[PDB]
Amino acid sequence: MREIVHIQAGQCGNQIGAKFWEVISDEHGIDPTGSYHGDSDLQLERINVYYNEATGNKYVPRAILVDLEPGTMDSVRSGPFGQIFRPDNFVFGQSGAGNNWAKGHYTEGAELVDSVLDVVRKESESCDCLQGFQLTHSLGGGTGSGMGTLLISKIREEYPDRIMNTFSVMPSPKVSDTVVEPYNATLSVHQLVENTDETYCIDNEALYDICFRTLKLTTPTYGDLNHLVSATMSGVTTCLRFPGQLNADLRKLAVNMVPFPRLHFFMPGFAPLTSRGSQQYRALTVPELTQQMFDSKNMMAACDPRHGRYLTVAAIFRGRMSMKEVDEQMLNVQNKNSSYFVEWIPNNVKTAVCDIPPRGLKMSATFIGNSTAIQELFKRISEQFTAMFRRKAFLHWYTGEGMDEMEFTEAESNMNDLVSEYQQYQDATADEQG
Amino acid sequence: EFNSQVTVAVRVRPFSKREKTEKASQVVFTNGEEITVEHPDMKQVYSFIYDVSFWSFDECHPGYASQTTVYETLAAPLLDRAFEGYNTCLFAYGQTGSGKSYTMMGLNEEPGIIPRFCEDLFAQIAKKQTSEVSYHLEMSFFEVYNEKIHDLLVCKGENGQRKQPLRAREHPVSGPYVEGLSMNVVSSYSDIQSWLELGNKQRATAATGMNDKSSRSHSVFTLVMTQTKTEVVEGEEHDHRITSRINLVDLAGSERCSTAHSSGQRLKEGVSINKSLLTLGKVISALSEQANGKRVFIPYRESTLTWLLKESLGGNSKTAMIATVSPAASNIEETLSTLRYATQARLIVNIAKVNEDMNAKLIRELK
Amino acid sequence: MRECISIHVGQAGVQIGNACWELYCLEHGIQPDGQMPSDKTIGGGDDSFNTFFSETGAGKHVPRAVFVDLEPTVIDEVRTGTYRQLFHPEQLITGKEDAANNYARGHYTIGKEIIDLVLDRIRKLADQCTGLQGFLVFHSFGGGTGSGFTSLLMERLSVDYGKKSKLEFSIYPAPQVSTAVVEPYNSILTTHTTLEHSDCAFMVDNEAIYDICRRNLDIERPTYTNLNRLISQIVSSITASLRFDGALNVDLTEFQTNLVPYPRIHFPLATYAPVISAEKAYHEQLSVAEITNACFEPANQMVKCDPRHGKYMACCLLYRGDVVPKDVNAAIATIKTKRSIQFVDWCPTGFKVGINYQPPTVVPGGDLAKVQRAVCMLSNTTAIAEAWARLDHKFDLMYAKRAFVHWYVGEGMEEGEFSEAREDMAALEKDYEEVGVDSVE
Ligand SMILES: CC(=O)O[C@H]1C(=O)[C@@]2(C)[C@H]([C@H](OC(=O)c3ccccc3)[C@]3(O)C[C@H](OC(=O)[C@H](O)[C@@H](NC(=O)c4ccccc4)c4ccccc4)C(C)=C1C3(C)C)[C@]1(OC(C)=O)CO[C@@H]1C[C@@H]2O
Ligand SMILES: Nc1nc2c(ncn2[C@@H]2O[C@H](COP(=O)(O)OP(=O)(O)OP(=O)(O)O)[C@@H](O)[C@H]2O)c(=O)[nH]1
Ligand SMILES: Nc1nc2c(ncn2[C@@H]2O[C@H](COP(=O)(O)OP(=O)(O)O)[C@@H](O)[C@H]2O)c(=O)[nH]1
Ligand SMILES: Nc1ncnc2c1ncn2[C@@H]1O[C@H](COP(=O)(O)OP(=O)(O)O)[C@@H](O)[C@H]1O
Ligand SMILES: [Mg+2]
Ligand SMILES: [Mg+2]
């Protein structure tokens, strides 16, 4: 019943989500026709979270594919799982946003957005009880940053009592892939802070290190990277589809992860990832998984938690785990690494355990963490931003589409206030005597 | 160099129809400056000191503070400083059915602070209206309702639903402000009264269990006063201007859903009020700890109210608080929360300055 | 669905079009007859790639291009050569008399009574296009038609179509080599008019490609059938994301944005790193880390201007073939580490990246090799100010004595148009100083 609408904006999200349905269908026993060819009877019990029944027990996903270019949509159709999506749910235009946040928000996206709302309002009304939404976009361009942030501004107005989860690829620290990353990443944060409840921040430079350092992959394509993001996307929504001993919805995590309404930027993770050789030399058990999850070298956010403090974290387990083995291990982290946690939250950790594991692993785990080390990502954009905006380098492509310099200054001070909201907590606090 | 302290004042209300039907006991006693609360259980007694106390419990007992008395004790100094060239703020705080709207706006035959303020302002202007000094006055009156902003001084068009919301923005110097807001000119008391009537008729009101005319929205009354003056200079005169913003704020109540029998829009709007008071409270708790050496970050962006009032709670204004309390024993903990937040607001210090409209230009370097 | 119009002005543009339309046909499976036999094996789809080639119901493919030269020689080669059965017979010759290398003839006098017959064909093509994304203009500073006509055209195209990307591929005059005594004027008069209307002007210089073809491909006696085949590749890279699949696709409005901070210094430089022959094709790895570093090797630039005398304001890398992003990020990280490649203080994110999957094709009779990887760089540098100053000094040496001006006045050009265009070119030389001065608080 806890139904979810998936929305995929840009060459990134439509490339991630396309793998997300290659990963969920294998978990629910759906073939590329929509026909069910599974083994267990638990798959079909809660397949309604992501899928809809069409005619003959053919299952059509609740996906929404949006972009300002038809090239990405052709890859989905001419692909493995192209024939299952609703062909009336592919919304597209031409003459894309040109790496301009001004176009996807005001000029071009505003022409195509009402078409997107037609799909959303039809899929949500067709759902019995909406748990929330799920957006996969890339801020750094103009479509996912512009046309995605605009949709959240509108769904939050129509559905203000529902969850709006977001899986966003953030700009990377070392090497750029778009020259105007700061202007587009900045203005998105000015909107996401006001209109989101969970925002999972992903960075490709970290996945390049995961794929190289852990998986021992020498030529990692974007398929492999998005084969990692889709995992966490499945772990967060596992306790709605399969049963367990301690279940956790989306709201139970945010209530246990968002202590103040603006600090909803997380550092995800997945366990157990290994190379194809070392698999025969490991022992799959919780103390082996918890060591990978809390490892700084297994994050996707390109931020070291050891330069901050975990305000609150979570752990979603899948398998025939032992709860004593789980509760004992999370306590070992806080008592050992007490400096990387806050004092005014006594138990900084939440846990959840499902009983039905991933297709080929006797046990998996998904990790979500809110830390003050996300300060480093926002503090960087604020430096690149003001360095360009102080000289007004590329600004005439944003004003020429119907924007003003004041809207560039608002987003700067907001992001700078979010830095201070995280920075007060990162410094160790002390009462008079306590 | 200036550090202006916030002027906190308290007003005890008389018993209500509910608190007389249920024959509730008196627990808030006064002696003048101090206000004490003897719990019924008689296990401990709390007492608080304030700059100003008002006791409207009895219309006969000595110490009875009236509308004119609260005015002449609180607002008249703010008017003096506003003419001096300061920005000023007067904001109410309390629970449901405690005398905030009656205190500030008042009724037809029992005026509050706002009409008296505007009247004495125009009187002093007409009495000092020389060719040496000219005066220009703009007003605005707006509303916060379910985190949405609304203009009160418009004649809405006919429709199934006609409430066009506005947006809040951040000007780098002037600070937060509202885009799309009617700033209407005023020459005398009559236009002010007409606009006040229109605004109080457009404001959101409802019937709940603790007040039949419960305001479902925060209300801000802004007056922008620009006084122009001369100095004999190399050329023409009329080369000094002093601007002053007066912000009179009437907020709603905490509204426990159990007592305030609420379902649907009342719950919804009530919940919004509860989220607005929690944020405001957190901002008054951080401003009272930032005036004691400890460094803290005030969260003004978590609520449109505190966001617009960034310049009043802190920053540049001479500001005053009117806490409103009920003397019954069935509301002790809420009265005490009000009094504790007021005693913490007493410790706030702002940096008030004269708006000469000349800094960095020429006479800053003269100085 | 995404369609781009090409405009080839002068002998230069036509001789690059012919180089271009020999390559666009091979990649997509088209013969010079306009036909497409490999549709037997797929059954339609979009292999008749609508970016360049429209299609008739009879199976014929006709390209979206407009040629114009004001001289019948170069275009009559097309109506009598291999590609006579491909092009629409409306190939705009009005060459009863050429422009005599005179921007006053190409703009006014002989530029009219042919500038109104060029807009009709474009307007005819656009009404066949649904998603028109922009124009691609091939011309040359140094002539009258490639200097006057283009200016005259780009003014009109900035009114009929307005806000659409107009990217130029123009041959910039070389510092030493030249084929005319009036390149300074026409190159200076054309910027002044084309500056406020174009969006990104890709420059090339034949003195550079001559050196590339000598050092790399081992061609010591080349001609223009070789140079124009390299330029054919640069355009295929820019337009590849509109035809084939990929991971990071780049629309036309991304070059207009990342490479052009201010609206007046939109003058980038181009490169093509793996310019190697079939023999040097072996003995070499040809990886991303190999190909990316060559694009900053100043000897492999396609315009003679050392970036080590200036600073980079932006850079766009366009990869093709078997390329993995992990190899790209490792490469840009190596360039950001080096100190001989300076970037402005107001662009710490100074790299745009795009990737495609379709490798380049090999024209038979060609000089280039078969490769699985290929890269095109597009860099906006402050070095280009040196070339403007050179053209400005030549202008002053020859305008102070009023040489060759009577040929321009004789074609309706005012004397004050040379002082107004040389004073507007002396502003841009100052703009490139400001963008190179490091900010201070
Ligand atoms: C033991 C064995 O025979 O091979 C393993 C294997 O080598 C490992 C390393 C697999 C392997 O994963 C990868 O090789 C990989 C490549 C790029 C990026 C990420 C992973 C495996 O492919 C993955 C596969 O696991 C799954 O298939 C999960 O069900 C996975 N399924 C998919 O994602 C999927 C993708 C495309 C099509 C169908 C299914 C999954 C992950 C998260 C949530 C649900 C399902 C397994 C056990 C293995 C192989 C096959 C080698 C791992 O898979 C994951 C992410 O759980 C990688 O680390 C685990 C540990 C496994 O032991
Ligand atoms: N790269 C390249 N440049 C060429 C080619 N043909 C001519 N040019 C250049 O064109 C420049 C002068 O322009 P023209 O050749 O006269 O061409 P045009 O635009 O028609 O000028 P007009 O004949 O006067 O109308 C010379 O400096 C050449 O370098 C060519 O095939 N390839
Ligand atoms: N992880 C991942 N990121 C991608 C992928 N493709 C693009 N991106 C990111 O998305 C950004 C490009 O923005 P994009 O949405 O494609 O621009 P648009 O085409 O104009 O909408 C870059 O910063 C990339 O880092 C992908 O396949 N995987
Ligand atoms: N000092 C007073 N004298 C007489 N009546 C009062 C006094 N204070 C409050 N009241 C009565 O109590 C009610 C106050 O409601 P109000 O102040 O509007 O609630 P809130 O302060 O929550 O907006 C009014 O109906 C008013 O008649
Ligand atoms: Mg009220
Ligand atoms: Mg010619």
Numbering used by the authors:
A (entry chain B): 1 to 434
B (entry chain K): -1 to 0, 391 to 755
C (entry chain E): 1 to 441
Copy the relevant paper text.
KIF14 is a microtubule-based motor protein with essential roles during cell division. Here we report the near-atomic resolution structures of twenty KIF14-microtubule complexes corresponding to five distinct KIF14 constructs in four nucleotide conditions mimicking four key steps of the ATP hydrolysis cycle.
The longer K772 construct includes a full neck-linker and the first coiled coil domain CC1. The faster migration of K772 is consistent with this construct forming dimers in solution, as expected from the presence of a coiled coil domain. Different from the Apo and ADP states in the AMP-PNP and ADP-AlFx states, the MT-K755 and MT-K772 helically averaged cryo-EM maps show a density connecting the motor domains along a protofilament. This density can be well-fitted with the undocked neck-linker of a motor domain positioned further toward the microtubule plus end (leading head) and part of the coiled coil domain connecting with a docked neck-linker of a motor domain positioned more toward the microtubule minus end (trailing head). The neck-linkers connecting density and the combined densities in the motor domain in the helically averaged cryo-EM maps strongly suggests that the KIF14 dimer in the AMP-PNP and ADP-AlFx states binds to the microtubule in a two-heads-bound configuration with leading and trailing heads in distinct conformations. The new maps with separated densities identify the leading head with the undocked backward pointing neck-linker as the one in the open conformation and the trailing head with a docked neck-linker as the one in the closed conformation. In the case of the MT-K755-AAF and MT-K772-AAF maps, there are also ADP-associated densities in both leading and trailing heads but AlFx-associated densities only in the trailing head. On the other hand, in the leading head of the two-head-bound structure, the neck-linker is pulled backwards (toward the microtubule minus end) forming a β-sheet with KL2 and in addition KH6 partially unwinds. On the other hand, in the trailing head of the two-heads-bound structures, the neck-liker is partially unzipped as it separates from the core motor domain disrupting the interactions with KH7.
